[PDB]
Design a binder for this molecule. Structure first.
Ligand SMILES: CCCCCCCCCCCCCCCCCC(=O)OC[C@H](COP(=O)([O-])OCC(O)COP(=O)([O-])OC[C@@H](COC(=O)CCCCCCCCCCCCCCCCC)OC(=O)CCCCCCCCCCCCCCCCC)OC(=O)CCCCCCCCCCCCCCCCC
Ligand SMILES: COCCOCCOCCOc1ccc(C(C)(C)CC(C)(C)C)cc1
Ligand SMILES: COCCOCCOCCOc1ccc(C(C)(C)CC(C)(C)C)cc1
Ligand SMILES: COCCOCCOCCOc1ccc(C(C)(C)CC(C)(C)C)cc1
Ligand SMILES: COCCOCCOCCOc1ccc(C(C)(C)CC(C)(C)C)cc1
Ligand SMILES: COCCOCCOCCOc1ccc(C(C)(C)CC(C)(C)C)cc1
Lengths: 56, 55, 110, 117, 81, 114, 81, 81, 81, 81, 81, 81, 81, 81, 81
C-alpha cells in the first residue's frame, strides 16, 4: 500500500540520526540522577516542558 | 629441520594476518569516510559513538 | 542540577518530536490551526532558515560565499567549446592527410 | 504372524518410508503415529502405533515390534478433540513436569487429527 | 608519450560468451530447489501444500539472476556498434 | 609403554563456556533499566534496532569508570575539526601554476623519483 | 590522440566456444532433478505420480537456460559477418 | 625507451561479461538456504516459525553480494566512455 | 576514423578447445543419473523396472547437451576457412 | 635491443570484472552456515540458543571474504587512471 | 576499409591445453559410478550381479565423452599445419 | 635477429583481478568447519566442548590460505610501479 | 588483402601449462574410488574382497585420463620447436 | 624469414595472479578433513585420540600443496629478472 | 606471404602459473581419502588397521599427480630461457 511505500522510502532518511538519539537517551537514563528523571516525569505529568523549566 | 620450517611458517603467518587485516580494515574505513564526506547527509555517527567502537 | 536535568530532558525531547510532528500534521490536514500554533510555527521557520544559512556555511567550507563560481570559472566552458572546435578542425585535417598517405601506400604496394 | 503383504508404509523420526520386497536391510525408530499396510489384494489396513522398531530382512521378512497397535476405526475424532486443548493448556502451563506432557500428547494427537481428517 | 586511441569492434562479442557461460550456473540452484521440494514432499506429503510457495520463490529469484546475465549478453550486441 | 593413567578431571572442558556465560550475564545484568525516562527509536517497521538497546549497558559502565570517562572524549573535537577542514578543502581555490608545478603525491613526478 | 577503428573477424568465433563451455553446466542439474525424482520414488512409490509433474517441469526450465546458452553460439555465426 | 599510451575502448565492454559470469554463483547458496529450510521443516513442522526469520535473512543477503556483482557491470557501461 | 579489418585464422582452432573444455561436465550428470538409479534400485529393487525409462531418459538429455557442445567444435573446422 | 614502454589504460577495468566474478563464490559458504543452524535446530530445538552465536559468527566470516574480494574491485577503479 | 589476412601458426597448439583441461572433468563421474555400485552392492549383495551391466555401461558412456575431447587434441596437431 | 623489449604496465592491474577471483574459493570450505561443529554438537551436545578446539583450529587454517591468496594481489600493486 | 604469417613460439610452452592445469583435476576422482571402497568396507567388511576388483578397475582407468592429459604437455616440448 | 625476439615483462605477473587464484583450492580440503574428524568424534568419542594423528597428517601434506603453489607465485616475482 | 617469426620470452612464465593453478585441485582429493578413513573408522573402529593399507595408496597416487602437475611448472622455468 501507499503507507508501505512511504515507509520503505523514508526508512533511510529517518534512520540516519536514530542511533545518536537512542545513544543520548540511554546515556541520560544511565548517567542522570534518578531524582532528576523523576522530576522530569513529574513536570511532564503536569503538562510542562522540563527543558524550559531547567533553563529558566 | 621441520621445527624451523614450522616456526618460520607460523611467524610469517601471524605477520601477514596482522598486516593484511589492519590494512583491509583501514581501507574500508577510508572508503566509507570518502562516501560520507562526499554525502554530508550521511556524515553522522550513523551506527553510534560507542556502539561501533565497542563492536 | 542543570546538567542532570539537561541530560534527563533528552528522552522527553526525542519522544515528543514525533508527538509534536503528528499533531502538526493533524492540525494542517484538519485545518484546526490557531494563532499560538501559527506563532510557534513562524518561530520554527525562522530558526530553520537560520540553521539553513549555517548549514550552507558549513557545507561550502567558506564563511563568506561559494568558490569556483564567477565569470572567470564560467568562461572555461566556452573556452572548452572553442578548444574542442579547434581540436576537431585540426584532427580532421591530420586524419585526412594520414588517410591519403595510407591509401597511397596501399594502392602502390597492395 | 508371517502374513503375505505387498507393501507397507511406516512413519519415522526422519520422516515417512515405504517398504517393498527385497528392500534394503535397515532398522530405525518408529515415530508415534499411524501405520499403513497394503496387502496383495489391493486392500489396505491402517493401525495407530506407539513407537517401536521395524526390522526389514533382505530375504523379505519384516518383523515389527511395538508397544501398542489399534486400528483407526476404534478411535473417534470426537473424544480426540477434547484432549487437544488439554494438551495445549498443559504445554502453555509453565512447568517442567507438565509442559513435556503437553508436548508429547500433542505429538501423538497431531498425526491423529491429520489422519482422521 | 604518444596516444593511440583504438576502438575494437570484435570485443563487442567476446563478453557475450562469458555472460552466456554464466547464464547456466543458476540452473544448479534451480534443480536443487525443486529437488528439495521433491524430497521434503516424499518425507511429508501432507506438508507439500505450504512448501510450494517457498519452492517457486527460490526458483524465481535464481532464474532472475540467469535472466539478468542473459539480458546483458543480448543488450551487448543488438544496440552497440 | 603401558603406563595405565587414570582420567584427570582437570584436563576436561566443562567450565570454560559456563564461565564465559557467567561473565556475559554479569555484563548484561548492568543493562537492566527502569521504565521512567525510557525511549528508543525503533526502525521504520516498528521493530527495535540492534545497537540501540545496548547503549545503556555501555554507558552504565562509563558511569562506573573513573578516568576514561573524563579523558577519552578529548579526541572527539578532532573529528569535527576534520569535518570542517574537509569541507574547506573540497572547494579551495588554488594557483594553477603551483598546481601544475607541485602536484601533491602525483605519479610520474621525477622530483619524487618515479 | 589518434583514433583507429579495427574490426576483428576472429572474435566472431571465439565466443562460440566460450558459451559452448556454458552449455554443459545445466547438464548436472538435469540429473540432479531426475535423481531427486528417483530417490523420492524409492522413498515413497505411491507419490511417484504426484511428483512427476515437477520432474518434467524441473528439467525443462533448467533445460531452457541450456537452450539460450546454446542459441547464442549458433546465432553467433550464420548471421554475423 | 619509448612510451606508447593506448586507450582500449573495447575493454569498456569486455569486463561486462567478466563480471556477469559471477552473477549466477550466489544462486546456488540462495536456493541452498531454502533447500535447508524445507528439509528442516520436514524434520520438524512445529519449528517452521522460528527458522523462517533465519530463512529470509541469508536469502536476501546472499543476493546482496549478487547485487554488488551486478552493480559493477551496470556501472561499467552507461557512465564510462 | 580509419577502418582496419583483420581475419585471424588462428581463432579457427582456439574456440574448438574452449568448447572442448566443457564437453566433460555433462559426464558428471550422466554418472549422477546412473548413481541415482543404482542406489534407488538397491533401496527398492521392485522399483528398478519403473525407474529404468527415467534412467535412459536422464542420461540421453544430459548426453544430448554434451553432443551439442561437441558438434560445435567439429562444425568449427571442416566447413570454415 | 629496443625498448617500448606501453601503458594500457584498458587494463584499469579488465581486472575489475574478475574481482567482481570472485565475490559470489563465498555466498554458498554464507548460506551454508544458516543451513547448518537450521538442520541443527531441526535435530535439537533446545540447543538453538547455544548455537546461534556460532551461526552469527560464521555468517560474518564467510561474508568477510566476499567483502575482502570486493575491496580489490572497488580499489581497482576509482583511483587508478 | 582495409584488409589484413593474418595466419597465427601459434594457435595450432593453444587449444590443445584447453581440450586437455576438459579431459579430466569426467573422472568425477567415472569414480561416481563405481562409488555407487560399491555402496549398492554393500546395502544389497544379492543385487550386485544385476547392477553390474549398469556399472560397465555408465563408466563407458562417461569415458566416451572424455575420449571425444582427447580425440580433438590429437586431431588438432598431426593434420593441421 | 631483432630484439624488442616491451614493458606492459597493464599486467600490473590485470593480475590483481586474476588473483582476486580466487580469494573467495576458500570461504565455502571455511563454513564447512562451523557447519560440521554445529551438526556434531547436534548429535552430541556434551562433546561440543572437546570439538570446539578443532572448530577454532579448523577456521584459522582454512581462512589462512584465503589471506595468502589475498597477499599477492596486494603485493602486486602497492610495491610494483 | 595482405598475408602476414606469424609463428608464435611461446605458445608451445604456454600450452604446456594449459594442459598442466588439467592434470590434477582427475585426482579427486582418483581418490574418490578408494574413499568409496573404505565406506563400503566399513558397511560390510566381508564384501571387501568382492569389491577390490571393481575398485582397481575404477581406480586405474580414472588415473589413465590424467596420463593422457600429462603425456600431451610432455610431448609438447621435447620435439616441437 | 626474419626473427623478431620480444621480452614481455608483463608476463612476470600474470602467472603470479593465476597461481594466486589456485592457492585457495586446498583450503576446502583442510576443513573437509577436520569436519570428518568432528563427525567421527561425535559418532564415537572414544575414537577421538586414534584419529588425531590422521587429523594432523591430513593437514600437513594438504597445506603443503597450497604452499607449493604459493611458493611458485612468490618465486615467480622476486627472482626472475 | 611473409614469414615473421616471433620468440616470446614472457611466455616462459605464464604457463607456470597455470600449472601452479592445477597443483591445488588434487588437495581436495587427497583430504577426501583421509576423511573417508576417519568416517570409516568411526563406522568400524577395529577395521581401522585393515583400511590403512588402502589409505596410503590413495594418498600417494593422488599426491603423485600433484607432483607431476608441480613438475612441469618447475621444469618450465629452470631449464627454458
Ligand atoms: C535521503 C535518502 C536519499 C538521499 C538522496 C539525497 C537527497 C535527499 C536529501 C535528504 C532527504 C530529506 C529527508 C529528511 C527529512 C526527514 O526527516 O524524513 C522523514 C520525514 C518524516 O516522515 P513521517 O512519515 O512523518 O515519519 C513518521 C515518524 O516521524 C517516524 O518516527 P521515527 O521513530 O521513525 O523517527 C524519525 C526521526 C525523524 O523524526 C521526525 O519526525 C522529525 C520530522 C521533521 C520534519 C521534516 C523536516 C524537513 C525539513 C526540510 C528542510 O526521528 C529522529 O531521528 C529524531 C531526529 C532528531 C535530531 C537528531 C539529534 C541528534 C543529536 C544532535 C545534537 C547533539 C547536541 C550535543 C548534546 C551533548 C550532550 C552531552 O519525512 C518528511 O517529512 C518528508 C520531507 C521531504
Ligand atoms: C509576526 O506574526 C504575524 C502573525 O500573523 C498571523 C496571521 O494571521 C493568521 C490567522 O489565521 C486564522 C486562521 C483560522 C482562524 C480560525 C477561523 C480557525 C479561528 C480561531 C483561530 C479563533 C479558532 C483564525 C485566524
Ligand atoms: C523548509 O525550509 C527550511 C529552510 O529553508 C529555507 C531556504 O532558504 C533559501 C536560502 O537561500 C540563501 C542562500 C544563500 C544566501 C547568501 C549567500 C546570500 C547568505 C550569506 C551572505 C549570509 C552567506 C542567502 C539565502
Ligand atoms: C568463546 O570464548 C571461549 C573462550 O574461553 C575462555 C576461557 O577462559 C575464561 C577466563 O575468564 C575468566 C576471567 C576471570 C575470572 C576470575 C573471576 C577468576 C577473575 C578473578 C581472579 C579476578 C576473581 C575467571 C575466568
Ligand atoms: C569480556 O567479554 C565480555 C563481553 O561481552 C559483551 C557482549 O556484548 C553484547 C551485549 O550487548 C547487549 C545486547 C543485548 C542486550 C539486551 C538488549 C539483552 C536485550 C533486552 C534488555 C531488551 C532483553 C543488552 C546488551
Ligand atoms: C644442494 O643443492 C644442490 C645444488 O643444486 C645445483 C643447481 O642445479 C644445477 C644447475 O646448474 C646448471 C646451470 C645451467 C645449466 C645450462 C645453462 C648449461 C643448462 C641448459 C643449456 C639446459 C639451459 C645447467 C646446469
Amino acid at each position: 500500500s501507499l503507507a508501505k511505500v512511504w515507509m520503505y522510502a523514508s526508512w533511510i532518511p529517518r534512520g540516519i540520526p536514530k542511533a545518536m538519539a537512542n545513544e543520548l537517551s540511554s546515556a541520560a537514563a544511565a548517567l542522570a540522577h534518578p531524582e532528576a528523571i523523576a522530576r522530569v516525569a513529574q513536570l511532564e505529568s503536569q503538562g510542562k516542558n522540563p527543558y524550559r523549566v531547567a533553563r529558566a | 629441520m621441520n621445527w624451523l620450517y614450522q616456526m618460520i611458517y607460523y611467524g610469517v603467518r601471524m605477520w601477514l594476518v596482522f598486516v593484511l587485516h589492519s590494512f583491509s580494515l583501514g581501507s574500508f574505513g577510508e572508503l566509507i569516510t570518502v562516501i560520507t564526506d562526499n554525502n554530508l547527509i550521511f556524515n553522522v555517527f550513523y551506527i553510534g559513538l560507542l556502539g561501533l567502537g565497542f563492536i | 542540577e542543570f546538567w542532570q536535568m539537561y541530560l534527563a530532558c533528552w528522552p522527553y525531547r526525542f519522544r515528543n518530536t514525533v508527538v509534536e510532528w503528528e499533531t502538526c500534521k493533524a492540525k494542517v490536514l484538519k485545518g484546526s490551526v490557531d494563532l499560538q500554533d501559527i506563532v510557534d510555527l513562524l518561530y520554527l521557520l525562522a530558526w530553520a532558515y537560520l540553521f539553513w544559512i549555517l548549514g550552507e556555511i558549513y557545507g561550502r567550507g567558506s564563511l563568506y560565499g561559494y568558490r569556483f563560481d564567477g565569470e572567470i570559472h564560467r568562461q572555461e566552458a566556452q573556452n572548452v567549446i572553442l578548444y574542442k572546435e579547434k581540436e576537431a578542425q585540426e584532427m580532421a585535417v591530420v586524419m585526412e592527410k594520414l588517410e591519403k598517405e595510407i591509401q597511397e601506400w596501399l594502392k602502390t604496394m597492395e | 504372524k508371517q502374513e503375505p503383504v505387498a507393501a507397507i508404509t511406516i512413519r519415522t523420526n526422519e520422516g515417512e518410508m515405504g517398504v517393498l520386497a527385497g528392500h534394503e536391510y535397515t532398522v530405525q525408530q518408529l515415530a508415534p503415529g499411524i501405520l499403513e499396510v497394503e496387502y496383495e489384494g489391493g486392500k489396505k489396513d491402517q493401525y495407530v502405533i506407539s513407537g517401536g522398531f521395524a526390522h526389514v530382512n533382505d530375504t523379505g521378512v519384516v518383523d515389527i515390534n511395538t508397544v501398542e497397535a489399534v486400528p483407526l476405526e476404534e478411535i473417534d475424532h470426537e473424544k480426540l478433540a477434547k484432549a487437544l486443548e488439554e494438551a495445549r493448556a498443559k504445554s502453555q502451563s509453565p512447568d517442567e513436569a507438565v509442559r513435556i506432557q503437553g508436548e508429547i500428547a500433542l505429538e501423538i494427537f497431531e498425526p491423529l487429527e491429520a489422519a482422521l481428517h | 608519450a604518444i596516444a593511440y586511441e583504438v576502438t575494437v569492434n570484435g570485443a563487442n562479442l567476446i563478453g557475450a560468451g562469458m555472460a552466456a557461460s554464466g547464464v547456466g550456473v543458476p540452473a544448479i540452484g534451480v534443480a536443487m530447489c525443486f529437488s528439495s521440494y521433491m524430497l521434503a514432499a516424499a518425507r511429508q506429503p501432507n506438508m507439500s501444500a505450504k512448501l510450494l510457495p517457498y519452492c517457486i520463490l527460490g526458483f524465481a529469484l535464481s532464474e532472475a539472476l540467469a535472466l539478468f546475465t542473459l539480458l546483458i549478453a543480448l543488450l551487448e550486441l543488438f544496440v552497440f556498434s | 609403554a603401558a603406563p595405565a593413567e587414570k582420567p584427570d578431571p582437570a584436563l576436561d572442558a566443562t567450565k570454560a563456556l559456563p564461565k564465559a556465560l557467567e561473565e556475559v550475564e554479569f555484563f548484561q545484568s548492568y543493562a537492566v533499566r527502569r521504565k521512567t525516562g525510557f525511549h528508543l527509536f525503533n526502525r521504520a517497521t516498528g521493530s527495535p534496532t540492534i545497537v540501540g538497546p545496548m547503549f545503556y549497558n555501555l554507558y552504565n559502565f562509563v558511569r562506573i569508570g573513573r578516568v576514561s570517562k573524563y579523558v577519552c572524549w578529548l579526541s572527539l573535537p578532532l573529528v569535527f575539526q576534520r569535518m570542517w577542514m574537509k569541507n574547506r578543502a573540497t572547494g579551495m581555490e588554488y594557483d594553477i601554476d603551483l598546481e601544475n608545478y607541485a602536484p601533491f603525491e602525483a605519479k610520474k613526478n621525477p622530483m619524487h623519483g618515479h
